[PDB]
Design a protein around this ligand. Structure first.
Ligand code: HEM
Length: 322
């Protein structure tokens, strides 16, 4: 019975006999948050949604349904330690975004809001939902802000090892590679299913925490490659963020060997982030964020993983050596 955590591509709209059941269940779940309240409202919504699916082949969520879905999907996230305070989430509605240039501006706003000069705020920007699967909006990055990973002559690493393929992809799309350890990768944005466009992230928007010892690391951990599933609808583009745990800042930029044996702690990080006033999930934050959450008072909705876009993209013509 274990279900796939991945939701792949489509080449045709979701069939009505498949969409309706899901939409109806979401709407129920939505109105269910009001036990005996809004019965006539619930039925009115069902009738409209069904009429919408029958006449247009799909349906649009309301801003409130979307907000509710983004928070439920967060709550339904198995490994997310931040899901305890699922209500502390700012939603940005970018569902009428049309171009990669517009996606770029939305992402800039997201990064700006979320970073908040260090006082990190959790947010999610929801781009248009998948229509026929041939006009998908996708962020080819794994994270909004991530360091480039460069291959060396001896087989070593310069930068983030986990971005080897993606970094290469960037270089192949024209991006000029500086060969440092902390090079912020550009944004590879796909809009309306078109070929991806490369956008440098304004250096100003990147807040970094200083760890020679020789290390830095961005303050904002924002997942950019997941898909939000809600009521049969699919949003292939919905970057979200929280704040670091400190337990993980992947400085796998290493030869950092510089008790038993496996004793490589994560202290300097906890301290470094705190003194530079960048939110990290320490005890005070865990407690405080939970307090804020309490004051506001098949798994679906859900955030799925996807097949890396460069492995599935049917190129048009743009950017050679793709
Ligand atoms: C508020 C701060 C947050 C913290 C400290 C936090 C922490 C975590 C941690 C530790 C993981 C596991 C390791 C990893 O996959 O990187 C994780 C995964 C994840 N988080 Fe968060 N998270 C936060 C906010 C969010 C937000 C705002 C969303 C979405 C709206 C979210 C959605 C997820 C999802 C979908 C995963 C993938 C793994 C899974 O859920 O099973 N997280 N988070």
């Amino acid at each position: 019975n274990p279900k796939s955590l991945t939701r792949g591509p489509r080449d045709k709209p979701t069939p009505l006999e498949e969409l309706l059941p899901h939409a109806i269940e979401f709407i129920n779940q939505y109105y269910g948050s009001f036990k005996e309240a809004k019965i006539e409202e619930h039925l009115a919504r069902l009738e409209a949604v069904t009429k919408e699916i029958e006449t247009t082949g799909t349906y649009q969520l309301t801003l409130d349904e979307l907000i509710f879905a983004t928070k439920m999907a967060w709550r339904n996230a198995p490994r997310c330690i931040g899901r305890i305070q699922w209500s502390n989430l700012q939603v940005f509605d970018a569902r009428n975004c049309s171009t990669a240039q517009e996606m770029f501006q939305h992402i800039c706003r997201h990064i700006l809001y979320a970073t908040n000069n260090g006082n990190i705020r959790s947010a999610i920007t929801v781009f248009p939902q998948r229509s026929d699967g041939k006009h998908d909006f996708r962020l080819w990055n794994s994270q909004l802000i991530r360091y480039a990973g460069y291959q060396m002559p001896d087989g070593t690493i310069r930068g983030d090892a986990a971005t080897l393929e993606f970094t290469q992809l960037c270089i192949d799309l024209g991006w000029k590679p500086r060969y440092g350890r902390f090079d912020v990768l550009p944004l590879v944005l796909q809009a309306d299913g078109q070929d991806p466009e490369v956008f440098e992230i304004p250096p100003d928007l990147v807040l970094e925490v200083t760890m020679e010892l020789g290390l830095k690391w961005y303050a904002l951990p924002a997942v950019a490659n997941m898909l939000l599933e809600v009521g049969g609808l699919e949003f292939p583009a919905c970057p979200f963020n929280g704040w670091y745990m400190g337990t993980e800042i992947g400085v796998r930029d290493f030869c950092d060997t510089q008790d038993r044996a496996v004793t490589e702690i994560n202290v300097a990080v906890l301290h470094s982030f705190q003194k530079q006033n960048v939110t990290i999930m320490d005890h005070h934050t865990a407690s405080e964020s939970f307090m804020k959450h309490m004051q506001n008072e098949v798994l679906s909705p859900f955030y799925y993983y996807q097949i890396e876009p460069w492995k599935t993209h049917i190129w048009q013509n743009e950017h050679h050596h793709h």
